Design a protein around this ligand. Structure first.
Ligand SMILES: [Mg+2]
Length: 258
């Protein structure tokens, strides 16, 4: 009998500031040092891909534009992967399919066990240089992520609201990114979609198929792709282009009881 909202977020320049650190638009728009902006941007980049290659089988998975994490769970025998050896096991298209699923389920396990202990996944001294990086990044972005997190966690703690993520970034890199920015705990992994292949609207429709017509969808983002896909599917769109937009969204989130 309760009304139900599904919030479909964009990641880059919506929930997090990352790409605009490399192009200098954020530093330029908010009066920050561009040299520092790029240094930080690149350091994060290296961390995202290093984590992706080192722990998320990216060198392997890269050439596989899978939308969702469980898309090849058909070929998964559910065995234990604790002692399973991925390095030496082959790296065909049937028994090979079972090895794929093994890697993606293993990615899922890493995410869930480390979404709140990303420093334990990354280890030392990576953990330490990471906490320092997130510290310079928060300072430079005037606490942008702090602002997005307030909305994300309010949608999380609320019973009839759901957080969904649609990102143009590939799936593996997108998860390393989500983890490194501390979003792993706010986004259930089954709720992340890589629109790298199919496109944003394709993912948007797929998400509606999953949640139903009786739900109220809200597309949140800064770009044209999400806004346009939101229009074609006739879903309310909430544009974000400054810290104030996040503040407004958070405010709406706290006035309603479903
Ligand atoms: Mg964007």
């Amino acid at each position: 009998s309760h009304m139900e909202r599904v919030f479909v977020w964009d990641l880059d320049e919506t929930i997090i500031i990352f790409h605009s650190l490399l192009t200098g638009t954020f530093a330029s728009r908010y009066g920050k040092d561009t040299t520092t902006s790029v240094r930080i941007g690149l350091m994060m980049e290296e961390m995202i891909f290093n984590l992706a290659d080192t722990h998320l089988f990216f060198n392997d998975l890269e050439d596989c534009d899978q939308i969702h994490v469980d898309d090849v769970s058909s070929d998964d025998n559910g065995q234990d992967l604790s002692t399973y050896n991925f390095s030496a096991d082959g790296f065909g298209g049937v028994d090979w399919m079972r090895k794929l699923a093994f890697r993606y389920r293993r990615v899922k396990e890493m995410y869930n066990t480390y979404k709140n202990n990303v420093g334990g996944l990354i280890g030392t001294p990576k953990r330490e240089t990471w906490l320092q990086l997130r510290a310079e990044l928060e300072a430079l972005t005037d606490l942008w992520l702090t602002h997005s997190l307030k909305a994300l966690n309010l949608i999380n703690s609320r019973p009839n609201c759901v957080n969904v993520l649609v990102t143009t970034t590939q799936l593996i890199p997108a998860l390393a990114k989500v983890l490194l920015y501390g979003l792993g705990s706010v986004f259930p992994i089954e709720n992340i979609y890589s629109a790298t292949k199919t496109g944003k609207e394709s993912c948007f429709e797929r998400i509606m198929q999953r949640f139903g017509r009786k739900a109220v969808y809200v597309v949140i983002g800064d770009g044209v792709e999400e806004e346009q896909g939101a229009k074609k599917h006739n879903m309310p769109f909430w544009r974000i282009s400054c810290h104030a937009d996040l503040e407004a969204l958070r405010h709406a989130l706290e006035l309603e009881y479903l």
